[PDB]
Design a protein around this nucleic acid. Structure first.
Length: 128
RNA sequence: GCUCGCUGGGGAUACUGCGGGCCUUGGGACCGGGAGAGGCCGGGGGUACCCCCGGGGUAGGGGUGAAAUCCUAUAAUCCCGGG
């Protein structure tokens, strides 16, 4: 059908957001923009605003190179770390929609352990 | 009356003790269909995490209330194929 589709991996955490566009197989990188290379202050990196700014740029290269459709794979750190995606996920998805890209299947691929390793912080956790 | 008692004899067998006899209620033994993360031994798996190699890809990654240390151009973070 000679139509260009790809996959947008959205690493969302409580400190940073990374948007990475690759081909259908994921073996070739088309664009990769993080939340830290679009804003200066460290506090703004996890902000939903920085996420959408990064997504706009990341989508620009995809449009230029010919990608028209994208399947979104949002993921939190997972494993022994936090599982809930950070705030900069819905913002990134909406920014990708707004930039003029068709959005296909949306799935969460956070790595869930089947009672794997020991989380950091000891038995008493963080005593902030 | 007291010396908290000792001793010579006679009488009773309700209770305790002792010897004997007969019972199943307590507790054990055994058969029947089932329940259970009860133990030990052998075989087979689950994702996740860490390291290494091969491909893509550039400049940040990580972390905090905010930062810094730390990793990163000897190609980091991230995605993919393998051990």
């Amino acid at each position: 059908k000679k139509e260009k589709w790809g996959i947008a991996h959205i690493y969302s955490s409580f400190n940073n957001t990374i948007i990475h566009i690759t081909d259908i197989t994921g073996a070739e990188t088309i664009s990769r923009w993080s939340g830290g290379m679009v804003v200066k202050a460290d506090r703004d990196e996890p902000s939903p605003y920085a996420a959408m700014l990064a997504a706009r740029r990341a989508a620009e290269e995809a449009l230029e190179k010919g990608i028209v459709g994208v399947h979104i794979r949002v993921r939190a750190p997972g494993g022994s770390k936090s599982k809930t995606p950070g705030p900069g996920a819905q913002a990134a998805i909406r920014a990708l929609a707004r930039a003029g890209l068709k959005i296909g299947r949306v799935e969460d691929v956070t790595p869930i352990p089947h009672d794997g390793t020991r989380p950091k912080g000891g038995r008493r956790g963080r005593r902030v």
